[PDB]
Design a binder for this molecule. Structure first.
Ligand SMILES: CCCCCCC(=O)O
Ligand code: NA
Length: 118
């Protein structure tokens, strides 16, 4: 779920939401070019995770609601029986964690369509 994903990001980092809404070549809707740094690489993978998720019947990562738990900054996926809920939760979980780990370069904030993401 796009909103739950927001919270995993909230639950695992210091950096706010708009902080990722549009950063580098892949953080944000769709992606082009080659990832910029490793934070953008987090977004690249997330993306791909979402594409694979779509390979599950009736599975829309973007709107699927799963069961997860947060205890700043640890987050857990409680889905077992719903294959889509779990695949998507791990997708989002892995991203949040990936984000908290990566450095935040302020010069990559809006290089979109600017030519490096061909
Ligand atoms: C385009 C609005 C979406 C969220 C992008 C979150 C991210 O960097 O994966
Ligand atoms: Na993207």
């Amino acid at each position: 779920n796009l909103y739950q994903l927001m919270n995993m990001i909230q639950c695992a980092n210091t950096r706010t939401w708009p902080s990722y809404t549009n950063y580098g070549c892949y953080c944000g809707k769709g992606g082009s070019g080659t990832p910029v740094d490793d934070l953008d690489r987090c977004c690249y993978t997330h993306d791909h995770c979402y594409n694979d998720a779509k390979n599950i019947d009736g599975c829309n990562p973007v709107t699927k609601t799963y069961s997860y738990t947060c205890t700043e900054p640890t987050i857990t996926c409680n889905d077992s029986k719903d294959k889509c809920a779990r695949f998507v939760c791990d997708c989002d979980r892995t991203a949040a964690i990936c984000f908290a780990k990566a450095p935040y370069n302020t010069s990559n904030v809006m290089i979109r369509s600017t030519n490096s993401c061909q």
